[PDB]
mmCIF file of all heavy atoms in Angstrom:
data_model
loop_
_atom_site.group_PDB
_atom_site.id
_atom_site.type_symbol
_atom_site.label_atom_id
_atom_site.label_comp_id
_atom_site.label_asym_id
_atom_site.label_seq_id
_atom_site.Cartn_x
_atom_site.Cartn_y
_atom_site.Cartn_z
ATOM 1 N N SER A 158 0.847 -1.182 0.018
ATOM 2 C CA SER A 158 -0.007 -0.049 0.075
ATOM 3 C C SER A 158 0.828 1.321 0.020
ATOM 4 O O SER A 158 1.861 1.254 0.695
ATOM 5 C CB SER A 158 -0.944 0.028 1.228
ATOM 6 O OG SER A 158 -0.182 0.252 2.278
ATOM 7 N N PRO A 159 0.418 2.283 -0.711
ATOM 8 C CA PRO A 159 1.138 3.623 -0.518
ATOM 9 C C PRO A 159 0.922 4.266 0.759
ATOM 10 O O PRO A 159 0.013 5.031 0.954
ATOM 11 C CB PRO A 159 0.520 4.419 -1.798
ATOM 12 C CG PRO A 159 -0.698 3.814 -2.039
ATOM 13 C CD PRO A 159 -0.617 2.321 -1.744
ATOM 14 N N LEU A 160 1.642 3.818 1.731
ATOM 15 C CA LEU A 160 1.331 4.272 3.192
ATOM 16 C C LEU A 160 1.894 5.640 3.431
ATOM 17 O O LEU A 160 1.638 6.080 4.613
ATOM 18 C CB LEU A 160 2.002 3.235 4.111
ATOM 19 C CG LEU A 160 3.560 3.257 4.487
ATOM 20 C CD1 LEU A 160 3.763 2.512 5.770
ATOM 21 C CD2 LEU A 160 4.405 2.701 3.335
ATOM 22 N N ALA A 161 2.338 6.422 2.493
ATOM 23 C CA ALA A 161 2.755 7.789 2.716
ATOM 24 C C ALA A 161 1.563 8.800 2.485
ATOM 25 O O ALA A 161 1.394 9.697 3.213
ATOM 26 C CB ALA A 161 3.813 8.179 1.790
ATOM 27 N N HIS A 162 0.686 8.444 1.468
ATOM 28 C CA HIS A 162 -0.448 9.271 1.184
ATOM 29 C C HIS A 162 -1.641 8.890 1.900
ATOM 30 O O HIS A 162 -2.669 9.707 1.873
ATOM 31 C CB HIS A 162 -0.839 9.054 -0.345
ATOM 32 C CG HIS A 162 0.401 9.383 -1.196
ATOM 33 N ND1 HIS A 162 0.860 10.596 -1.551
ATOM 34 C CD2 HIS A 162 1.164 8.543 -1.873
ATOM 35 C CE1 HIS A 162 1.915 10.469 -2.315
ATOM 36 N NE2 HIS A 162 2.138 9.260 -2.566
ATOM 37 N N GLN A 163 -1.595 7.832 2.704
ATOM 38 C CA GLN A 163 -2.771 7.438 3.529
ATOM 39 C C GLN A 163 -2.732 7.974 4.939
ATOM 40 O O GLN A 163 -3.555 7.653 5.837
ATOM 41 C CB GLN A 163 -2.849 5.869 3.567
ATOM 42 C CG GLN A 163 -3.347 5.330 2.266
ATOM 43 C CD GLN A 163 -3.122 3.810 2.227
ATOM 44 O OE1 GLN A 163 -2.367 3.258 3.038
ATOM 45 N NE2 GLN A 163 -3.756 3.282 1.239
ATOM 46 N N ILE A 164 -1.793 8.922 5.248
ATOM 47 C CA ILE A 164 -1.801 9.608 6.505
ATOM 48 C C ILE A 164 -2.647 10.895 6.430
ATOM 49 O O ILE A 164 -3.122 11.340 7.553
ATOM 50 C CB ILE A 164 -0.305 9.893 6.949
ATOM 51 C CG1 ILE A 164 -0.081 9.781 8.392
ATOM 52 C CG2 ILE A 164 0.172 11.220 6.354
ATOM 53 C CD1 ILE A 164 1.341 9.738 8.820
ATOM 54 N N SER A 165 -3.079 11.301 5.341
ATOM 55 C CA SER A 165 -4.007 12.505 5.195
ATOM 56 C C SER A 165 -5.425 12.071 5.271
ATOM 57 O O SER A 165 -6.158 12.911 5.647
ATOM 58 C CB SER A 165 -3.655 13.232 3.910
ATOM 59 O OG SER A 165 -2.264 13.692 3.852
ATOM 60 N N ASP A 166 -5.764 10.792 5.070
ATOM 61 C CA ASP A 166 -7.111 10.398 5.266
ATOM 62 C C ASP A 166 -7.395 10.164 6.744
ATOM 63 O O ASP A 166 -8.496 10.497 7.126
ATOM 64 C CB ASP A 166 -7.407 9.101 4.376
ATOM 65 C CG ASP A 166 -7.289 9.420 2.925
ATOM 66 O OD1 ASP A 166 -7.358 10.569 2.532
ATOM 67 O OD2 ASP A 166 -7.346 8.366 2.171
ATOM 68 N N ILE A 167 -6.468 9.655 7.401
ATOM 69 C CA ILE A 167 -6.627 9.529 8.910
ATOM 70 C C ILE A 167 -6.495 10.932 9.532
ATOM 71 O O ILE A 167 -7.311 11.197 10.484
ATOM 72 C CB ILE A 167 -5.590 8.563 9.570
ATOM 73 C CG1 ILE A 167 -5.588 7.276 8.688
ATOM 74 C CG2 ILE A 167 -6.109 8.207 10.937
ATOM 75 C CD1 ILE A 167 -4.634 6.231 9.240
ATOM 76 N N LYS A 168 -5.695 11.725 8.938
ATOM 77 C CA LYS A 168 -5.582 13.074 9.584
ATOM 78 C C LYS A 168 -6.874 13.966 9.207
ATOM 79 O O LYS A 168 -7.132 14.858 9.999
ATOM 80 C CB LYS A 168 -4.281 13.786 9.191
ATOM 81 C CG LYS A 168 -3.831 14.818 10.255
ATOM 82 C CD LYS A 168 -2.467 15.067 9.954
ATOM 83 C CE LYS A 168 -1.498 14.086 10.633
ATOM 84 N NZ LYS A 168 -0.201 14.770 11.137
ATOM 85 N N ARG A 169 -7.567 13.649 8.161
ATOM 86 C CA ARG A 169 -8.683 14.381 7.825
ATOM 87 C C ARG A 169 -9.953 13.798 8.561
ATOM 88 O O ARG A 169 -10.797 14.575 8.947
ATOM 89 C CB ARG A 169 -8.997 14.304 6.316
ATOM 90 C CG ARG A 169 -10.273 15.030 5.927
ATOM 91 C CD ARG A 169 -10.113 16.529 5.896
ATOM 92 N NE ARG A 169 -11.292 17.241 6.154
ATOM 93 C CZ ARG A 169 -11.352 18.561 6.376
ATOM 94 N NH1 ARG A 169 -10.229 19.234 6.168
ATOM 95 N NH2 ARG A 169 -12.544 19.153 6.648
ATOM 96 N N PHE A 170 -10.014 12.471 8.789
ATOM 97 C CA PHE A 170 -11.071 11.908 9.415
ATOM 98 C C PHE A 170 -11.050 12.142 10.900
ATOM 99 O O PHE A 170 -12.179 12.383 11.520
ATOM 100 C CB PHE A 170 -11.195 10.365 9.238
ATOM 101 C CG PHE A 170 -11.846 9.601 10.276
ATOM 102 C CD1 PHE A 170 -13.235 9.603 10.245
ATOM 103 C CD2 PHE A 170 -11.229 8.769 11.198
ATOM 104 C CE1 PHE A 170 -13.952 8.802 11.196
ATOM 105 C CE2 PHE A 170 -11.942 8.068 12.135
ATOM 106 C CZ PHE A 170 -13.361 8.161 12.092
ATOM 107 N N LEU A 171 -9.891 12.228 11.459
ATOM 108 C CA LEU A 171 -9.839 12.498 12.907
ATOM 109 C C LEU A 171 -9.997 13.915 13.289
ATOM 110 O O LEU A 171 -10.348 14.258 14.399
ATOM 111 C CB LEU A 171 -8.436 12.083 13.460
ATOM 112 C CG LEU A 171 -8.220 10.535 13.653
ATOM 113 C CD1 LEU A 171 -6.888 10.289 14.240
ATOM 114 C CD2 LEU A 171 -9.356 10.031 14.662
ATOM 115 N N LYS A 172 -9.929 14.881 12.366
ATOM 116 C CA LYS A 172 -9.910 16.311 12.734
ATOM 117 C C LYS A 172 -11.312 16.792 13.134
ATOM 118 O O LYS A 172 -11.437 17.136 14.346
ATOM 119 C CB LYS A 172 -9.465 17.143 11.541
ATOM 120 C CG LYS A 172 -9.466 18.611 11.799
ATOM 121 C CD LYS A 172 -9.699 19.466 10.592
ATOM 122 C CE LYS A 172 -9.109 20.826 10.758
ATOM 123 N NZ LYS A 172 -9.404 21.427 12.132
ATOM 124 N N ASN A 173 -12.290 16.755 12.253
ATOM 125 C CA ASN A 173 -13.581 17.273 12.725
ATOM 126 C C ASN A 173 -14.401 16.104 13.199
ATOM 127 O O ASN A 173 -15.494 15.704 12.730
ATOM 128 C CB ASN A 173 -14.199 18.053 11.549
ATOM 129 C CG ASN A 173 -14.125 17.308 10.367
ATOM 130 O OD1 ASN A 173 -13.501 16.150 10.280
ATOM 131 N ND2 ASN A 173 -14.538 17.891 9.224
ATOM 132 N N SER A 174 -13.984 15.490 14.260
ATOM 133 C CA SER A 174 -14.736 14.515 15.140
ATOM 134 C C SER A 174 -14.680 15.054 16.575
ATOM 135 O O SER A 174 -15.158 14.285 17.480
ATOM 136 C CB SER A 174 -14.057 13.191 15.096
ATOM 137 O OG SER A 174 -13.074 12.964 15.946
ATOM 138 N N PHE A 175 -14.229 16.276 16.818
ATOM 139 C CA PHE A 175 -14.277 16.805 18.179
ATOM 140 C C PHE A 175 -14.590 18.280 18.039
ATOM 141 O O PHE A 175 -14.985 18.796 16.952
ATOM 142 C CB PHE A 175 -12.846 16.604 18.835
ATOM 143 C CG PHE A 175 -12.841 15.393 19.778
ATOM 144 C CD1 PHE A 175 -12.346 14.181 19.277
ATOM 145 C CD2 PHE A 175 -13.433 15.464 21.021
ATOM 146 C CE1 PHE A 175 -12.305 13.139 20.111
ATOM 147 C CE2 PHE A 175 -13.460 14.399 21.796
ATOM 148 C CZ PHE A 175 -12.939 13.266 21.321
ATOM 149 N N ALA A 176 -14.295 19.076 19.113
ATOM 150 C CA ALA A 176 -14.726 20.413 19.068
ATOM 151 C C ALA A 176 -13.796 21.325 18.162
ATOM 152 O O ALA A 176 -14.294 21.823 17.188
ATOM 153 C CB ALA A 176 -14.659 21.009 20.605
ATOM 154 N N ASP A 177 -12.465 21.459 18.513
ATOM 155 C CA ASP A 177 -11.636 22.236 17.670
ATOM 156 C C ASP A 177 -10.172 21.665 17.886
ATOM 157 O O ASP A 177 -9.539 22.033 18.834
ATOM 158 C CB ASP A 177 -11.734 23.702 18.056
ATOM 159 C CG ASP A 177 -11.856 23.922 19.502
ATOM 160 O OD1 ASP A 177 -11.935 22.962 20.344
ATOM 161 O OD2 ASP A 177 -11.904 25.179 19.857
ATOM 162 N N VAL A 178 -9.736 20.937 16.956
ATOM 163 C CA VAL A 178 -8.404 20.434 16.866
ATOM 164 C C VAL A 178 -7.737 20.977 15.692
ATOM 165 O O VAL A 178 -8.356 21.361 14.711
ATOM 166 C CB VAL A 178 -8.272 18.959 16.983
ATOM 167 C CG1 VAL A 178 -9.071 18.365 18.194
ATOM 168 C CG2 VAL A 178 -8.707 18.314 15.749
ATOM 169 N N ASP A 179 -6.347 21.031 15.602
ATOM 170 C CA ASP A 179 -5.604 21.505 14.536
ATOM 171 C C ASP A 179 -4.899 20.258 13.885
ATOM 172 O O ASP A 179 -5.023 19.130 14.291
ATOM 173 C CB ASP A 179 -4.553 22.421 14.921
ATOM 174 C CG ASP A 179 -5.052 23.693 15.655
ATOM 175 O OD1 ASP A 179 -6.334 23.817 15.771
ATOM 176 O OD2 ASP A 179 -4.398 24.478 16.159
ATOM 177 N N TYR A 180 -4.292 20.541 12.732
ATOM 178 C CA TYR A 180 -3.542 19.383 12.090
ATOM 179 C C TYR A 180 -2.167 19.197 12.661
ATOM 180 O O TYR A 180 -1.600 18.161 12.387
ATOM 181 C CB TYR A 180 -3.440 19.606 10.668
ATOM 182 C CG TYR A 180 -4.702 19.510 9.798
ATOM 183 C CD1 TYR A 180 -5.209 20.506 9.143
ATOM 184 C CD2 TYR A 180 -5.289 18.220 9.760
ATOM 185 C CE1 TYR A 180 -6.442 20.349 8.438
ATOM 186 C CE2 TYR A 180 -6.387 18.047 9.040
ATOM 187 C CZ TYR A 180 -6.952 19.093 8.287
ATOM 188 O OH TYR A 180 -8.102 18.940 7.684
ATOM 189 N N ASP A 181 -1.704 19.957 13.635
ATOM 190 C CA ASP A 181 -0.556 19.726 14.323
ATOM 191 C C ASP A 181 -0.679 19.190 15.707
ATOM 192 O O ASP A 181 0.256 19.130 16.532
ATOM 193 C CB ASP A 181 0.391 21.014 14.274
ATOM 194 C CG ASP A 181 -0.305 22.210 14.815
ATOM 195 O OD1 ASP A 181 -0.651 22.253 16.016
ATOM 196 O OD2 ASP A 181 -0.408 23.134 14.013
ATOM 197 N N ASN A 182 -1.881 18.945 16.044
ATOM 198 C CA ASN A 182 -2.331 18.326 17.396
ATOM 199 C C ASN A 182 -2.700 16.843 17.158
ATOM 200 O O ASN A 182 -3.068 16.198 18.153
ATOM 201 C CB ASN A 182 -3.417 19.003 18.001
ATOM 202 C CG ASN A 182 -3.002 20.420 18.448
ATOM 203 O OD1 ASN A 182 -1.898 20.696 18.677
ATOM 204 N ND2 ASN A 182 -4.057 21.196 18.877
ATOM 205 N N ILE A 183 -2.516 16.331 15.882
ATOM 206 C CA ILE A 183 -2.827 14.953 15.636
ATOM 207 C C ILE A 183 -1.576 14.222 15.217
ATOM 208 O O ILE A 183 -0.739 14.877 14.335
ATOM 209 C CB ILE A 183 -3.974 14.767 14.539
ATOM 210 C CG1 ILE A 183 -5.106 15.730 14.839
ATOM 211 C CG2 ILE A 183 -4.442 13.401 14.444
ATOM 212 C CD1 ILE A 183 -6.100 15.771 13.739
ATOM 213 N N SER A 184 -1.202 13.120 15.742
ATOM 214 C CA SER A 184 0.102 12.365 15.408
ATOM 215 C C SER A 184 -0.285 11.004 14.975
ATOM 216 O O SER A 184 -0.888 10.241 15.794
ATOM 217 C CB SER A 184 0.915 12.519 16.556
ATOM 218 O OG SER A 184 0.735 11.412 17.452
ATOM 219 N N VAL A 185 0.034 10.626 13.758
ATOM 220 C CA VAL A 185 -0.217 9.328 13.196
ATOM 221 C C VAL A 185 1.016 8.574 12.985
ATOM 222 O O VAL A 185 1.783 9.067 12.028
ATOM 223 C CB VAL A 185 -1.143 9.432 11.954
ATOM 224 C CG1 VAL A 185 -1.538 8.040 11.476
ATOM 225 C CG2 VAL A 185 -2.414 10.184 12.282
ATOM 226 N N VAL A 186 1.264 7.492 13.669
ATOM 227 C CA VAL A 186 2.456 6.642 13.343
ATOM 228 C C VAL A 186 2.004 5.259 12.946
ATOM 229 O O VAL A 186 1.474 4.491 13.749
ATOM 230 C CB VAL A 186 3.381 6.492 14.671
ATOM 231 C CG1 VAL A 186 4.475 5.689 14.362
ATOM 232 C CG2 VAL A 186 3.827 7.910 15.117
ATOM 233 N N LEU A 187 2.064 5.110 11.620
ATOM 234 C CA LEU A 187 1.563 3.846 11.074
ATOM 235 C C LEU A 187 2.696 3.097 10.445
ATOM 236 O O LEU A 187 3.829 3.613 10.118
ATOM 237 C CB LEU A 187 0.360 4.127 10.057
ATOM 238 C CG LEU A 187 0.596 5.058 8.880
ATOM 239 C CD1 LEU A 187 1.146 4.433 7.685
ATOM 240 C CD2 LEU A 187 -0.665 5.733 8.560
ATOM 241 N N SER A 188 2.448 1.768 10.102
ATOM 242 C CA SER A 188 3.470 0.886 9.627
ATOM 243 C C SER A 188 2.757 -0.276 8.873
ATOM 244 O O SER A 188 1.511 -0.601 9.040
ATOM 245 C CB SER A 188 4.342 0.377 10.754
ATOM 246 O OG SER A 188 3.619 -0.443 11.701
ATOM 247 N N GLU A 189 3.554 -1.113 8.212
ATOM 248 C CA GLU A 189 3.212 -2.246 7.460
ATOM 249 C C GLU A 189 3.323 -3.514 8.334
ATOM 250 O O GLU A 189 3.932 -3.511 9.317
ATOM 251 C CB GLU A 189 3.957 -2.330 6.203
ATOM 252 N N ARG A 190 2.658 -4.607 7.873
ATOM 253 C CA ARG A 190 2.765 -5.837 8.589
ATOM 254 C C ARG A 190 3.943 -6.589 8.317
ATOM 255 O O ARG A 190 4.743 -6.188 7.340
ATOM 256 C CB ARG A 190 1.464 -6.694 8.371
ATOM 257 C CG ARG A 190 1.642 -7.539 7.077
ATOM 258 C CD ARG A 190 0.675 -8.650 7.070
ATOM 259 N NE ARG A 190 0.250 -9.103 5.778
ATOM 260 C CZ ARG A 190 0.943 -9.886 4.971
ATOM 261 N NH1 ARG A 190 2.177 -10.422 5.395
ATOM 262 N NH2 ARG A 190 0.546 -10.234 3.854
ATOM 263 N N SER A 191 4.317 -7.601 9.059
ATOM 264 C CA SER A 191 5.548 -8.327 8.971
ATOM 265 C C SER A 191 5.357 -9.429 7.834
ATOM 266 O O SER A 191 4.411 -9.541 7.239
ATOM 267 C CB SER A 191 5.852 -9.032 10.275
ATOM 268 O OG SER A 191 4.749 -9.837 10.666
ATOM 269 N N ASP A 192 6.385 -10.164 7.619
ATOM 270 C CA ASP A 192 6.444 -11.214 6.583
ATOM 271 C C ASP A 192 5.558 -12.281 7.188
ATOM 272 O O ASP A 192 5.707 -12.796 8.384
ATOM 273 C CB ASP A 192 7.805 -11.649 6.308
ATOM 274 C CG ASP A 192 7.811 -12.860 5.365
ATOM 275 O OD1 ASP A 192 6.992 -13.035 4.493
ATOM 276 O OD2 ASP A 192 8.603 -13.843 5.570
ATOM 277 N N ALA A 193 4.793 -12.943 6.330
ATOM 278 C CA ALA A 193 3.870 -13.982 6.722
ATOM 279 C C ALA A 193 4.602 -15.200 7.069
ATOM 280 O O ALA A 193 5.502 -15.648 6.449
ATOM 281 C CB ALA A 193 2.744 -14.212 5.659
ATOM 282 N N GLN A 194 3.937 -15.993 8.001
ATOM 283 C CA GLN A 194 4.438 -17.287 8.497
ATOM 284 C C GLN A 194 3.480 -18.367 7.935
ATOM 285 O O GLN A 194 2.304 -18.332 8.505
ATOM 286 C CB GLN A 194 4.613 -17.346 9.908
ATOM 287 C CG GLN A 194 4.896 -18.819 10.393
ATOM 288 C CD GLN A 194 6.244 -19.240 10.016
ATOM 289 O OE1 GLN A 194 7.281 -18.478 9.753
ATOM 290 N NE2 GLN A 194 6.375 -20.590 9.902
#
């Protein structure tokens, strides 16, 4: 997955779900899964 451009969908969905947050008050640390066993 292009996991670099998918941090703006979580940052957009999380923003206007509360009273008033900014885009520098949200921190998204995401990663890919390991090799399958």
Side-chain angles (χ1 to χ4, degrees), residues 158-188 190-194:
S158 67
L160 79 161
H162 309 281
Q163 287 166 348
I164 211 163
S165 298
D166 291 347
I167 314 184
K168 209 163 273 210
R169 180 77 210 177
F170 159 72
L171 280 183
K172 181 207 203 319
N173 42 5
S174 87
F175 263 101
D177 40 357
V178 306
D179 305 353
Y180 284 117
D181 55 66
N182 290 343
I183 314 172
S184 85
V185 182
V186 179
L187 54 89
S188 66
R190 79 156 156 86
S191 52
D192 173 41
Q194 172 68 28

